C-alpha cells in the first residue's frame, strides 16, 4: 500500500502544478490555495511512502508522475504545444530526472 500513497503523492504534484498555472503568480485566490495545500499533501504522503519505500525509487516515481502529469494536463487544459521535438526533449528530460533520482 506504501506504493499507492506514493502514486497519490505524485498525483497531487500534478494538482498544485496545474493550480499554480491558474493562480497567475499566486494572485488568484483558490488556485493559489489549491497549490499550497497540494504540495503539503504531496510532501506529507511522500514522507509517508518514503518511510517504507527506497528514498531513491520513491522520489523517481514521485517527480516522474508529477513531471509527466504536468506535461499531459498542460497540453490538454492550457492547450500547450505538442511538437515532435518537444515531446522528445521532454522524454529525454524526464528520463534524466527519473534516472538521477533512481540511482541515488
Amino acid at each position: 500500500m506504501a506504493w499507492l500513497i506514493l502514486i497519490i503523492a505524485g498525483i497531487f504534484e500534478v494538482v498544485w502544478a496545474i493550480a499554480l498555472k491558474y493562480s497567475n503568480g499566486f494572485t488568484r485566490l483558490i488556485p493559489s490555495m489549491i497549490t499550497l495545500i497540494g504540495m503539503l499533501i504531496s510532501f506529507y504522503l511522500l514522507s509517508q511512502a518514503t518511510k517504507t519505500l527506497p528514498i531513491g525509487t520513491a522520489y523517481a516515481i514521485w517527480t516522474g508522475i508529477g513531471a509527466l502529469g504536468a506535461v499531459i494536463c498542460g497540453i490538454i487544459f492550457f492547450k500547450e504545444p505538442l511538437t515532435a521535438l518537444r515531446i522528445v526533449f521532454m522524454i529525454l528530460l524526464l528520463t534524466g530526472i527519473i534516472g538521477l533520482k533512481a540511482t541515488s
Binding site: 503568480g25 499566486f26 494572485t27 488568484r28 485566490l29 483558490i30
Partner: protein, 89 residues
Amino acid sequence: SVPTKLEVVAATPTSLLISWDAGHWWEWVTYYRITYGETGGNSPVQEFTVPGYSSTATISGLKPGVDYTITVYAPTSDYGSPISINYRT
C-alpha cells in the same frame, strides 16, 4: 471586473469601515491593497495590503472632517480596473 461595489459600511470621525464585492470564486484574489489619502491634499496616500479572502477592511487614524479618497486594488489590473470612492469623515 474585480473588486466591485466599494462602499463605506461604518464610519467614525477617525475611522472608516469599507467593503467591496470580491466577485465569484474564480474572481477571488490572494490580496487586495487599499489606498487612502486626503483628496487633493499635499500628503501622499497611505497603503496596506488586505488578505484576498476578505471583502472588508477598516481604515484608522483619520483626520475628522477631511475628505478621503479610498481605492481597492486587485493584484493585477488584468482582472479589473481599481475602484475608488470619496468619503468625508
